[PDB]
């Protein structure tokens, strides 16, 4: 497939750059021309601006980074999605949406799981939601992640639980 092709070119041009230690400049550079790489192939814009954001945040997540220079990673992210057309807030979700269901389909465990939706939460914050629609926001994330995916009636209720403690954490 051509929008397949470029997809891979596309991954592969974003990660090794992120591999060798590259800064906020020199990255946005290169986000661009995975993003016009897309373009010229087949996707919309919005929708090649959103895929380099997911190559992006997912490489982020795997190779192990803390909480601070992930949320570098998902502001760089999100004015990206901005440049290319996406509302503020549409774009801080989508963000939150991408990190929060790789994190699930990985398998991180609960606490891991919570450090991610709190970090959602303060993305979709700091972009112009207040603390408690964030949270629902998150909890709207993962619950219907989950749903799609197919889990059980046990996890689904121990997804709950989670979404709960989220929510009850941000003055609900």
Same mark, same amino acid.
């Given at each position: 497939?051509? *929008? #397949?092709?470029? %997809?891979? =070119?596309? /991954? &592969? $041009?974003?990660? +090794?750059?992120? !591999? @060798?230690?590259?800064?906020?400049?020199?990255?946005?550079?290169?986000?661009?021309?995975?993003?016009?790489?897309?373009?010229?192939?087949?996707?919309?814009? *919005? #929708?090649?601006? %959103?895929? =380099?954001? /997911? &190559? $992006?945040?997912? +490489?982020?997540? !795997? @190779?192990?980074?803390?909480?601070?220079?992930?949320?570098?990673?998902?502001?760089?992210?999100?004015?990206?999605?901005?440049?290319?057309?996406?509302?503020? *807030? #549409?774009?801080? %979700?989508? =963000?939150? /949406? &991408? $990190?929060?269901? +790789?994190?699930? !389909? @990985?398998?991180?465990?609960?606490?891991?799981?919570?450090?991610?939706?709190?970090?959602?939460?303060?993305?979709?914050?700091?972009?112009?939601?207040?603390? *408690? #629609?964030?949270? %629902?926001? =998150?909890? /709207? &994330? $993962?619950?219907? +992640?989950?749903? !799609? @995916?197919?889990?059980?009636?046990?996890?689904?209720?121990?997804?709950?639980?989670?979404?709960?403690?989220?929510?009850?954490?941000?003055?609900?």
């Amino acid at each position: 497939d051509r *929008e #397949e092709a470029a %997809f891979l =070119a596309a /991954s &592969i $041009l974003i990660q +090794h750059a992120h !591999e @060798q230690g590259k800064d906020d400049r020199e990255l946005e550079k290169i986000l661009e021309i995975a993003i016009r790489i897309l373009e010229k192939n087949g996707v919309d814009r *919005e #929708e090649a601006a %959103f895929l =380099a954001a /997911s &190559i $992006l945040i997912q +490489h982020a997540h !795997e @190779q192990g980074k803390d909480d601070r220079e992930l949320e570098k990673i998902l502001e760089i992210a999100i004015r990206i999605l901005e440049k290319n057309g996406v509302d503020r *807030e #549409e774009a801080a %979700f989508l =963000a939150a /949406s &991408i $990190l929060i269901q +790789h994190a699930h !389909e @990985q398998g991180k465990d609960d606490r891991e799981l919570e450090k991610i939706l709190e970090i959602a939460i303060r993305i979709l914050e700091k972009n112009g939601v207040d603390r *408690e #629609e964030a949270a %629902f926001l =998150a909890a /709207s &994330i $993962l619950i219907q +992640h989950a749903h !799609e @995916q197919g889990k059980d009636d046990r996890e689904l209720e121990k997804i709950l639980e989670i979404a709960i403690r989220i929510l009850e954490k941000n003055g609900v």
